[PDB]
């Protein structure tokens, strides 16, 4: 009559939590893509404007 | 079996054990039944000094047979605990002992709880769960008490690197100041940084006693692959490298970033921005610097 | 005895984790495409603005 499930739910419980966390840090490697692509959107934006610059250099 | 232990203050106490034993490891058996160490316990009975180790049943000790508990007044190391008020109280110790079971001794003497307790040696605060010796805490040592006050606790923030840390806080701390002392213990910048705890985000702006947090709670933290703040930096080569960094990271603190990256080392590092050379002392922020400011790298040839 | 009521939930709602950890490595490696791409960008402006300089310079000589 041993309860060893006792400390196999245990270690499920923290395994569970962990998830949790696991997901949680996906999130936040998903936010951060955005950050940065929204980074990268604003320099093309900023590469573009030389690129006007100097198409528009004769006139 | 079966044998009584009967200091001359008249106290019996009792607990089972088999004669193949030794007088030893009963004292070992005594100290968490009530609580004596074995460096201040000396058995007799029968007017037989029992020395620390030849067969119980070499003594000639049966069940039901009487023992004489002597205690020394003194064990074999003492510290001394310097109060706020100018108090010093003095504590029998081994170098065993945890800063719990220092703790205990201190609600002892004078009734302070021991989650109330902070106890510093060397300018250092010590952690519950580590013994004397790790600190290097010797014979007639001065450790510091400091009482927690406005509700303070401890806490713990666990990250998926399996790191456990440690934090002395108050209910009124921010989540920013959380971070802050984060920051303090483990270089992590807080805008990198976020907690969790339930399963909450926890909010900039709110504090802990928002979220309910109260003592030996455990916060989780994550970490995010980027801050607010990125400035570029040209290599050797000519390529455009990114880094992590804040406002108030001094040169030193880029240099060595750089190191990371490039593997170049800080004295041989040299960084132009807008023609000015970038003075180790200095931060960012001193020299009008931006997100996404450019950076020049130059060597020193020393 | 019901233990074996959760041990083996347990199991079954853990099975979800390694997808998690597969999906962080993608969204890792996304991040740093997205800012190995803003890096060459940074450059790209670097070359145009280099183009300026040395179109006014020489167009004053």
Do not use: W
Request: proline share 3%; hydrophobic share 35%.
């Amino acid at each position: 009559q041993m309860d060893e499930m006792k400390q196999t739910i245990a270690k499920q419980e923290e395994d569970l939590e962990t998830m949790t966390i696991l997901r949680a840090q996906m999130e936040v490697y998903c936010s951060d893509f955005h950050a940065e692509r929204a980074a990268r959107e604003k320099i093309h934006e900023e590469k573009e404007q030389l690129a006007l610059q100097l198409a528009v250099l004769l006139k | 079996m079966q044998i009584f232990v009967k200091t001359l203050t008249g106290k019996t106490i009792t607990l089972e054990v088999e004669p193949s034993d030794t007088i030893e490891n009963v004292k070992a058996k005594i100290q968490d039944k009530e609580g004596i160490p074995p460096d201040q316990q000396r058995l007799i009975f029968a007017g037989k000094q029992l020395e620390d180790g030849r067969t119980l049943s070499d003594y000639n000790i049966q069940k039901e047979s009487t023992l004489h508990l002597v205690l020394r007044l003194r064990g074999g190391m003492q510290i001394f605990v310097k109060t706020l008020t100018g108090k010093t109280i003095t504590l029998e110790v081994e170098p065993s002992d945890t800063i719990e079971n220092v703790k205990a001794k201190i609600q002892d003497k004078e009734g302070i709880p021991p989650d109330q307790q902070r106890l510093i040696f060397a300018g250092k605060q010590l952690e519950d769960g580590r013994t004397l010796s790790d600190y290097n805490i010797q014979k007639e040592s001065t450790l510091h008490l400091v009482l927690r006050l406005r509700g303070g606790m401890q806490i713990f923030v666990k990250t998926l690197t399996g790191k456990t840390i440690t934090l002395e806080v108050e209910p009124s701390d921010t989540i920013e100041n959380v971070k802050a002392k984060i920051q303090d213990k483990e270089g992590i910048p807080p805008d990198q940084q976020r907690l969790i705890f339930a399963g909450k985000q926890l909010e900039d702006g709110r504090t802990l006693s928002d979220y309910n947090i109260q003592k030996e709670s455990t916060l989780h933290l994550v970490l995010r692959l980027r801050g607010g703040m990125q400035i570029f930096v040209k290599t050797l080569t000519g390529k455009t490298i990114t880094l992590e960094v804040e406002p108030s990271d001094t040169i030193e603190n880029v240099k060595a970033k750089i190191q990371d990256k490039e593997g170049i080392p800080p004295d041989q590092q040299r960084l132009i921005f807008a023609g000015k050379q970038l003075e180790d002392g200095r931060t960012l922020s001193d020299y009008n610097i931006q997100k996404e400011s450019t950076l020049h790298l130059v060597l020193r040839l020393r």
